[PDB]
Assembly symmetry: D2
Homo-oligomer: 466 residues x 4
Amino acid sequence: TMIVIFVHGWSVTHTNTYGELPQWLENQSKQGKLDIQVGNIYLGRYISFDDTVTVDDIARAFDQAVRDEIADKLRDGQRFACITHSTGGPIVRKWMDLYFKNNLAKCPLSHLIMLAPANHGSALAQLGKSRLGEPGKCVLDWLELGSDMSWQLNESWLDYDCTANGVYSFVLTGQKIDRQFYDAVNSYTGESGSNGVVRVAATNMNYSLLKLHQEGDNGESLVVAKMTRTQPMAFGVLPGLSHSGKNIGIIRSITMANAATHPTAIWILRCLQVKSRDSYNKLVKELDNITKETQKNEHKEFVKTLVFTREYITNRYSMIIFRLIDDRGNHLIDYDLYLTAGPQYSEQALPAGFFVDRQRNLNNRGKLTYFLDYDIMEGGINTPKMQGNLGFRVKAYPESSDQALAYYRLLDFHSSLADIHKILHPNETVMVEIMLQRRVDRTVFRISNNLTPAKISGKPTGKKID
Amino acid sequence: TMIVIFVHGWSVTHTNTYGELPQWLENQSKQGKLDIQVGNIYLGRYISFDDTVTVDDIARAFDQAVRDEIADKLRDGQRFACITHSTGGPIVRKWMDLYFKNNLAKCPLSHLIMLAPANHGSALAQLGKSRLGEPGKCVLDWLELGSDMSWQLNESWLDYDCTANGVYSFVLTGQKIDRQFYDAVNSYTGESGSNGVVRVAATNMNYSLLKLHQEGGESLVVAKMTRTQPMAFGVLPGLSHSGKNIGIIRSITMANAATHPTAIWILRCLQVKSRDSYNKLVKELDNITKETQKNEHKEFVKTLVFTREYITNRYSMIIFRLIDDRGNHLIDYDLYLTAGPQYSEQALPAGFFVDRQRNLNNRGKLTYFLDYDIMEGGINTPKMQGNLGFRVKAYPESSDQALAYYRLLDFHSSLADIHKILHPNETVMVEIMLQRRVDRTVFRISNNLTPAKISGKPTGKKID
Amino acid sequence: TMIVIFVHGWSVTHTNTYGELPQWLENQSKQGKLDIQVGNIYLGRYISFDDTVTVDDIARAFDQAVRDEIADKLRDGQRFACITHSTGGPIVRKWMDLYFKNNLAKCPLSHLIMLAPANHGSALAQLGKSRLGEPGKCVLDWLELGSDMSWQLNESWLDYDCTANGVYSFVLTGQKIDRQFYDAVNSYTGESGSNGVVRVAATNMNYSLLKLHQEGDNGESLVVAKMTRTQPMAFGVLPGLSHSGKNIGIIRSITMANAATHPTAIWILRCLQVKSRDSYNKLVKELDNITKETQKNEHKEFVKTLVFTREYITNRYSMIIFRLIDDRGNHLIDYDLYLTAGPQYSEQALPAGFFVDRQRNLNNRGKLTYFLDYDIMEGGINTPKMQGNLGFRVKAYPESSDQALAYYRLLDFHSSLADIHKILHPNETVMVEIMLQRRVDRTVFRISNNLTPAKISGKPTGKKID
Amino acid sequence: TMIVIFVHGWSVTHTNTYGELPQWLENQSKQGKLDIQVGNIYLGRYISFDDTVTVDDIARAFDQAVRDEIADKLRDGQRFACITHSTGGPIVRKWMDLYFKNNLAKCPLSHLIMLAPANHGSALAQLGKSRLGRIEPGKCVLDWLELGSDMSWQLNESWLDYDCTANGVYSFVLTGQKIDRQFYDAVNSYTGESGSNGVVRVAATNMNYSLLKLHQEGESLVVAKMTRTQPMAFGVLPGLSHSGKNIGIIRSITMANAATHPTAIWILRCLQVKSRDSYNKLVKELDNITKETQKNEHKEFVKTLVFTREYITNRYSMIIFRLIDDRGNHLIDYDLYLTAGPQYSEQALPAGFFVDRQRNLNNRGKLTYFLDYDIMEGGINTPKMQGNLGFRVKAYPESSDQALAYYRLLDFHSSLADIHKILHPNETVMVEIMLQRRVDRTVFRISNNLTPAKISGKPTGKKID
Ligand SMILES: NC(=S)c1ccc[n+]([C@@H]2O[C@H](COP(=O)([O-])OP(=O)(O)OC[C@H]3O[C@@H](n4cnc5c(N)ncnc54)[C@H](O)[C@@H]3O)[C@@H](O)[C@H]2O)c1
Ligand SMILES: NC(=S)c1ccc[n+]([C@@H]2O[C@H](COP(=O)([O-])OP(=O)(O)OC[C@H]3O[C@@H](n4cnc5c(N)ncnc54)[C@H](O)[C@@H]3O)[C@@H](O)[C@H]2O)c1
Ligand SMILES: NC(=S)c1ccc[n+]([C@@H]2O[C@H](COP(=O)([O-])OP(=O)(O)OC[C@H]3O[C@@H](n4cnc5c(N)ncnc54)[C@H](O)[C@@H]3O)[C@@H](O)[C@H]2O)c1
Ligand SMILES: NC(=S)c1ccc[n+]([C@@H]2O[C@H](COP(=O)([O-])OP(=O)(O)OC[C@H]3O[C@@H](n4cnc5c(N)ncnc54)[C@H](O)[C@@H]3O)[C@@H](O)[C@H]2O)c1
């Protein structure tokens, strides 16, 4: 039999954040659609408004909360399904990483259903505690785009295979703005490609990590590339749902009256009924078809008022998180990073409208997140004259011996959107780690058996050390 | 045969920084006291005035400078002695660590003679580029007391056995201030227990790392102390860091070298060829240290206007590193020394303190500089019972304050027995790991499906 | 007779910055078009790349340079015209302020011809020294949008009447981007409404200062408004001209061969020929006609390449510099500032596309600069449904007694874009000083003749002090 | 008739901070010692633990508090005496400055009795909010109390022009210099600083101070101008710390001990002052008590079961330096030297002259030195040292070759042997040094050679006017 545990998001102070979905699941079980005994549905509550509490702290506390309440039930063979919202996803994923990484088959969790999870962060976190209010400062450090902590967790997750270990994981999210909750001085709260809080691409656990490492001898720079990708995970963009709120909040808006027709309740029930690789994979495809339908139907939105009418265009988007490092363990903080396109990989040739947002992490200036319009990029680049080309160029500083005796050579990376080995996918994040060679001029240290003392020159030799 | 390589200190722009010692060593070899062929004495020069250059960079560049110039001689069997001054010591130790840590026996270096090395940092580094000029910011990051980089290098060196691998390493330093070069606005330039730039205790490669890990509703402490292998250590008389007057290497001339302590003892160090020869020199230099520090204990300087008395005892340096068991460096804490039968923070001997500095890049790094002779004399008395200890209060300190918090740590020790943590002329590294306590309220689950406000009230019980 | 002194801009290291215009003016005098003796055209050179040198320093040093070189000529009755570029404008205006503020009739300057002057700052200055390279840090503090120093100078200049004192002042600028010099990672270098460095609106010496002062006891918050405007100054937006460069730089591109047909050279000669109020006002109107013609003709720009075609739309823009203070001498650093529109003055009703940029000064967080599309604002607000309404709402924090015992009441200002008393004009900056009342609850200090000692409560009374 | 208003210090949360002194005064009045009607003794309470509230806010609120409670009594001729503790002194002085500066005769206050007031700041304020509550306080008040604060400078510069006595306002400062050694914070040694009561330095309580202006002209020359406050009664009472029921200057007063308590005794005297002649006699009496107290407390021996401590307390001076130039800048990059001896060397100060230095965190041109006056005087006023004492200021950049805008060194030569000295035991001296900002002529040149050329930054060696 199944236990269900609800886990909420950040800045929550009341378990009504779960709407009435717990009570509904209870009733569905009584109707034979789920095998949940009365008393096996649990509401989680964790503290998100304490500046001292870290995500590590919360994930450790969940392990304790589980043992304190259902240790007997787990010993008797029961496994639980977690239904998470917002930060709840990352926290449960961290708990899995802390206690079961190399051993998912013994994890007492059977289903992970993440609702609008901030798996690759929220652009709002950087706005900080004062403006955002409420949220705890340490959890905002995790949620900040480009966070070193989310990078570490998500790099660890590249190696996971939940499905093969009998753990069925799902991401469901929406991309509707509840336009009554638009903060006019913080336009992230209405950002296209988001639900007001998390970007669709930042919810998706289908992502890649691309490592580009600079090589070279005496002469010119070369680039070795390696891409690794997470295992497939169910991913669905459901229609008409925002992050929060009783109107169209992805979970907040569920009631006993509307649940039967509520996309979230409908698909959560399906997810929980998965018991096999075959059933999982059918739901993967079903949710992908729903995604395609949702995003076509919501592409254009017309909002009518007594005074004005607005048109809103919602395409599909990609998020790049760049990590700039060198081969001596430094994060690079002084650099220019270019996208390039066209037959000559020009920084001036990107399709007009490619850009939505950029943000640089406040704790690590080597972490830079770009948010791009995938459909505008693909349409403009995959033409005869543009040849499908897409690339990066990174210029780190100092750039030559004449400026400093330690310096970096420019890196160029040439790719394509015209084949299946591409680095951008709609509704996905890609993590890009660029490692430059730290070049040190031989003048940094010379020895000479001329014993006549002399002034020490800083003039470069023009030849780097090994 | 022997090759010699000179390696200078920070902010140097001219190889006259070496005085005339290279030419003197060349003459000593012709007289038969050394086996150095003409042309096998090398002057090292590196860039310490470039803000982009790191100690990692310089040590890597040393490897290339060596290969570029004497690769042939090293294949032909020759090994080299490095004579370093100031940061040159750490730099050569970093090179050894990058290229030979697990294989010192293959290291082409046979002798490491460090003159006034900033092995555990310089208090002046924090004063920073502008005030100190000139020096390069990244090297100052390394030299800053409590630096994460020097800690990492010196923690690595706990495992070295240079002598066992045929590498004979020596530290020589002085503790005389050149009083013509006192910066009245920056009194570190005349600090007792230093030569104006480096503290005697900060040069010594004889040091311990003491780990104190909190365990446990009752707080306990597990202590573990590890110590470097013995290295030759000599405090030479009448020598300051730099300058032609009494600079430890700068003042050496062809005329005075035969009477100059640095030249005399460097020649002895170079002649060491065996464990037995090495150990003889360890003892001799220790005797010279004891003699120097007694003779220089009281210094009288009289001018036409006034007469100053300067007292110089012997000193100990503590570098504290405060962390927790979840990978955090701790930044909000109070650290107490304690003494007396009750381990009171109010009972330290009067005059025990010289200095404290907190690292600007890592606030979990705190360096105390103490007068060992005042401490020992006040603590090892009948009424004080020899007690010395630490108390650390990290914040937040309780559930009601925050749902993640720390319990006080108390460590109780003694200066009365051989297992003591403080030694004269030594730095001690103290890593204290507290347990991060998280109250169970941080996460609860309930099968009461009736929604309700979430309370932050502590349970008073911590999670595993 | 006339002396001419050229004065360059920031980051300049070579007097070829002036093009060949000095040599050309020399020949126009020899042909009887100007009254400039041989040897009475001077090239100014000042140091813009020293981090210790201030705008105050440079204006003081200009005075010394003039006395060192032409004191005798000035004693004999000669006066000089300054032709300035970029920062040179602000610098000569500071010199006028330091030495002749209350006394412009004694000023030895007869004409001030400012070419693309950064009179209200440059958005690029905040990007700082490293990224911009070169430029001196203290001059960048002046040029920064919202700078306290430029505010002080320009508030002083509200009281000037150059024309009445026989000083003929002119601003000429362009709004063409030299698209060869677009920095892809810093899009200010191609900002619509700018020449790549200075926004048209930031060059204009026709501007207003609007003071909004909050009044009211307990009960109702009310606002007293006072607007002051500079005297009219000649202002022209010339066609086809960018900030810099030999291609189309407003002064750099002038050669002996093209000068006769070069807009800058042609209109400089007209300005130098002004000798009276009547000729000045004639030129004011002629240049306004040129501005209207330029901005219609350049409204749409099509750039064709072998690979793609770009369309660029340039309207007319307004810049607002907000200064937030209170009645006790504090700059406010914690506030939300809203534009409002529609019949209900809603922050949600602004015309779509109204916004170009916002910047907050790094030295004074009470200084906030918005850059707006005037033509989109006007077209959307001046409709039957929108009634012409435009307003401000300022929410400063803390906002109530319950949050802090010293707090601020919200301020609302209601205006119109349909009257001649409007606060926005195309191609103009408006300075908006908002002064809020600092409310202090009576609990901050009480006295009682009950001598029984008791704990001190911080509970607000709900009544403020006088 | 007299009204008495009690005003407390910072971080206070309970009106027992006043000890039993208000009740004792009431009892004293019921016996004829004072003419205070029953009901005319008021306890003041203000908020010091709110980060948004400033000293300006508190002084404004004091005015409202007074009008709200005793407006009728003041309209009918009554005037009040303020008995203040710690920050209460500066607060009441700010209220006087806001509402009565050039009109003290109309001020309803008749007596200002300041107990251990932080008139020139507290060294502890820089330690900030988190650290101080562990030894709570509102950040904006700490900005006022910080040594070298721009706000205290402004109030105390304004007070140079006051003459309370001439306007019928009788002002007094009483303080102590005893450490309550049970409340020593081992990691923050300011809490036991010699020359202080654990919170405020005696020299920082004193309203007898000077402002010395040194303006550079020009070789460099220096014009000096010293202005001094009017005499104010100043007494250092024996055996009294800042706070605590043990020996706290006001906290330790009880009905039982008040008759023998130095604070109650001398407060009563101060309140009874009704004339210039009575005031001046009290000034001299209090100065005698100061000399006695500081002689009797010069040496303190503290004995325990484990050890014995000797503590030496001399008399101290505090210098607050303010470095500016003639163009409105505060200087942030400089070296400041004291100098002594026949050649005004920075190496010739008497050994032990120094206690403390602190630089303001909001204005790096504000530097506070705390010096041992008795050590300074004894070492400088000798035949070989000639009584010399001076300042040298080296601001940066210091030459054309370093920067085209730069400063020339300033040297000021003075003496501790004459009556016009700048240092006084138990006093603060504010020193404003204004340097000439020198700008090399290369910063702007004009030339009628129309051949374009590179712009040289080489300095000319001649400055602009
Ligand atoms: N603020 C939102 S929702 C937003 C939207 C899109 C991109 N970004 C990026 O996210 C990062 C941080 O955004 P940001 O801090 O808003 O940056 P931004 O550069 O827009 O603003 C800088 C500062 O000015 C403040 N400010 C701006 N406008 C107002 C206003 N009307 N009233 C009051 N204060 C104002 C703002 O709160 C912040 O402290 C930057 O990289 C932005 O480019 C932010
Ligand atoms: N400066 C030296 S040599 C010194 C000596 C002993 C201990 N320490 C410790 O080292 C750390 C840094 O020293 P610090 O920055 O000098 O600290 P300190 O607190 O003494 O000085 C604070 C600031 O004021 C400046 N300042 C102080 N006196 C003067 C003066 N006479 N002229 C100009 N500026 C002045 C000083 O340069 C610094 O920027 C602190 O932890 C000190 O306690 C420093
Ligand atoms: N930078 C230009 S030209 C620009 C354009 C429009 C508005 N603004 C506003 O001006 C202010 C300062 O702009 P900003 O500092 O660029 O803020 P922004 O929020 O765009 O960038 C934050 C930081 O990220 C850095 N960064 C962003 N993208 C890249 C990249 N591709 N390569 C390297 N570093 C990158 C950038 O240099 C800065 O240090 C903010 O208020 C912006 O919203 C700037
Ligand atoms: N702290 C006191 S009471 C004190 C005494 C005399 C002079 N001063 C001057 O006042 C200014 C500020 O003093 P400061 O912040 O103490 O400067 P200091 O330079 O002594 O300390 C630097 C930093 O290290 C911290 N620190 C030092 N010792 C310990 C310890 N045992 N446990 C935990 N943390 C420690 C201290 O809190 C501070 O954040 C400086 O100019 C000092 O020289 C302070």
